[PDB]
């Protein structure tokens, strides 16, 4: 049998993920991919840093999420430190935490529609995506990778503006999602390109430990978005999509309705924000203000020491996970009792979502296999967990 390794080929998509194919003439029936192109030494590296200093290495763990990562870290730290965050701060973590889902669910369709080979829905949506990075630069520090969420809540307040901008932005977005509905849904060939492909629906679709979509849209109703709270996140109203059967085209149609939920939540979140503060007030965790660290005596000693070493975290293990826009996000943060943490093991999606490519692939073509991968939305560097 021919043993071609169609992978390292820089054939668009993402020139990585080099695997083997022991194809039985035309059908595959055996797929054993290799990973480890970026191992980077991540989990060993954090063992020498402090809590505030290690924080951007959670940010660079995806390619896409900037505020959904570091959402799974501060909320994994504030439980250890007996802190609730202040109420103005929680309305921003839901706002940017429900704006990164309008970055994955744009990239999760176009990049899938580029491996397939369509050109024009790649350029028709990233030109609208530019209207959104101006937000990131205006609020935090940079284009994408922002050390913005801290353990002491939000870093700083978003400036004057950004409320007649987001309302200006979000009132003209549903026309753009009505474009791709005409581009892909009512079309037949793309429907014929993906129906009854990847029919994985049994209880081994959950014994493989999958997280969401490539879950509930295939069947079993469950999510971490209204059975487990984060912040002020249950006080808004929305629904969660479910597809019919257990193929890719009934996990594709989650993502059209999923983007039709984030517009509602943003248009529901803006009406409910109170004026208030930014940081936690007790200042053993938050740094004091700049106009304060130049006047009093108490401000500097709880400033100058708070950057030489970090916080004082109590011992005892902990664990949590939140909704990453492609899955769960496990962090088993072992604390020791000093400024420097102990072991920090992460669970990212793709461990389950790509080990189950063995079950999902066989009985099918070779041209099916590239169409499988862009449905799970697998990003490397994120499989470094």
């Amino acid at each position: 049998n021919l043993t071609l390794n169609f992978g390292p080929q820089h054939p668009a998509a993402h020139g990585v993920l080099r695997l083997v194919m022991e194809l039985s003439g035309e059908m595959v029936r055996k797929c054993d991919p290799h990973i480890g192109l970026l191992h980077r030494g991540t989990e060993k590296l954090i063992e020498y840093k402090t809590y505030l200093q290690a924080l951007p290495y959670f940010d660079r763990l995806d390619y896409v999420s900037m505020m959904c990562n570091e959402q799974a870290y501060s909320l994994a730290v504030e439980k250890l430190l007996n802190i609730q965050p202040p109420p103005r701060a929680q309305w921003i973590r839901v706002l940017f935490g429900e704006i990164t889902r309008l970055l994955n669910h744009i990239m999760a369709v176009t990049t899938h529609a580029l491996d397939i080979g369509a050109m024009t829905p790649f350029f028709w949506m990233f030109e609208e995506r530019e209207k959104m990075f101006e937000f990131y630069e205006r609020v935090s520090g940079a284009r994408m990778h922002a050390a913005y969420v801290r353990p002491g809540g939000v870093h700083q307040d978003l400036p004057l503006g950004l409320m007649d901008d987001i309302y200006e932005f979000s009132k003209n977005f549903s026309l753009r999602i009505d474009e791709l509905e005409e581009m892909l849904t009512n079309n037949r060939i793309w429907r014929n390109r993906t129906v009854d492909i990847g029919i994985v629906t049994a209880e081994d679709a959950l014994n493989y430990g999958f997280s969401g979509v490539m879950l509930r849209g295939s069947g079993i109703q469950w999510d971490l978005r209204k059975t487990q709270p984060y912040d002020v996140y249950d006080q808004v109203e929305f629904d969660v999509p479910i597809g019919s059967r257990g193929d890719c085209y009934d996990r594709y149609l989650c993502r059209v309705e999923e983007m039709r939920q984030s517009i509602r939540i943003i248009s529901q979140c803006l009406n409910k924000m109170p004026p208030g503060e930014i940081k936690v007030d007790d200042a053993k965790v938050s740094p004091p203000k700049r106009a304060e660290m130049k006047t009093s005596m108490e401000s500097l000693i709880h400033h100058f020491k708070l950057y030489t070493e970090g916080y004082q975290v109590p011992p005892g293990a902990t664990y949590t996970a939140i909704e990453a826009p492609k899955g769960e996000f496990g962090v088993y943060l072992v604390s020791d009792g000093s400024s420097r943490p102990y072991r920090c093991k992460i669970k990212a999606p793709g461990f389950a979502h790509l080990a189950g490519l063995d079950k999902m692939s066989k009985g099918h073509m070779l041209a099916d296999v590239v169409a499988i991968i862009g449905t799970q939305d697998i990003v490397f560097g994120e499989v470094d967990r």
């Binding site: 020498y48 802190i83 209880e203 109590p314 293990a317 902990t318 664990y319 496990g330 000093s338 669970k347």
Partner: protein, 208 residues
């Protein structure tokens, strides 16, 4: 006490004190310590003789579904006289409850793996072999994932230093990309950060 302090609750602290109690009652063969976390988490310390059946007991029931294997990790602890610490984490689907399984071991003593019990441990179980050398029993395919092909280190333990020994370089001496002993441009200046005076009263050690 005030705002900006996490409001704890007692309802989940009650049932998780209730549920895990009669778990040791109905298998006093493998369970050696159960503890309740002060924020609604549970540990069931298990000697690894019962690595398969206790999972197999939590694999199915009518009062405990627990069929969502989320997290297999591995934590080393030197100065314990049995170093390593395999820790699971599993999820009840119908009940919204988290519980972990802490099973210690040592290096050379193997562990009966969870291959028939769960099929999400296909790539997780191999990782501990590549990173520590904990040889699980009866796995159908033990291989090398997430490391390079020529390492002999099992790096995630503590004696392996920060850099390796294998700083790689190219020469045009013939064609090859050859290995070499490691050479840095900078020390990685190691600080000293542990302030004295014991900020924590509750976790005070036995004073001997």
């Amino acid at each position: 006490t005030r705002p900006t302090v996490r409001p704890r609750n007692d309802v989940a602290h009650k049932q998780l004190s209730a549920f895990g109690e009669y778990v040791a009652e109905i298998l006093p063969k493998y369970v050696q310590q159960v503890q309740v976390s002060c924020f609604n988490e549970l540990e069931i310390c298990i000697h690894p003789d019962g690595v398969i059946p206790v999972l197999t007991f939590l694999r199915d029931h009518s009062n405990a579904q627990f069929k969502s294997l989320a997290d297999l990790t591995a934590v080393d602890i030197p100065t314990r006289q049995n170093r390593f610490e395999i820790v699971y984490n599993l999820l009840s689907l119908r009940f919204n409850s988290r519980i972990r399984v802490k099973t210690y071991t040592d290096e050379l003593t193997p562990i009966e793996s969870s291959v028939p019990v769960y099929k999400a441990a296909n790539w997780y179980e191999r990782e501990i072999w590549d990173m520590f050398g904990v040889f699980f029993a009866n796995h159908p395919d033990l291989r090398r994932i997430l490391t390079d092909y020529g390492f002999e280190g099992h790096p995630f333990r503590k004696d392996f230093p920060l850099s390796g020994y294998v700083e790689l370089r190219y020469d045009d001496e013939v064609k090859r990309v050859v290995a070499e002993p490691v050479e840095l441009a900078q020390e990685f200046r190691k600080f000293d950060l542990n302030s004295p005076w014991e900020a924590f009263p509750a976790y005070r050690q036995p004073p001997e």
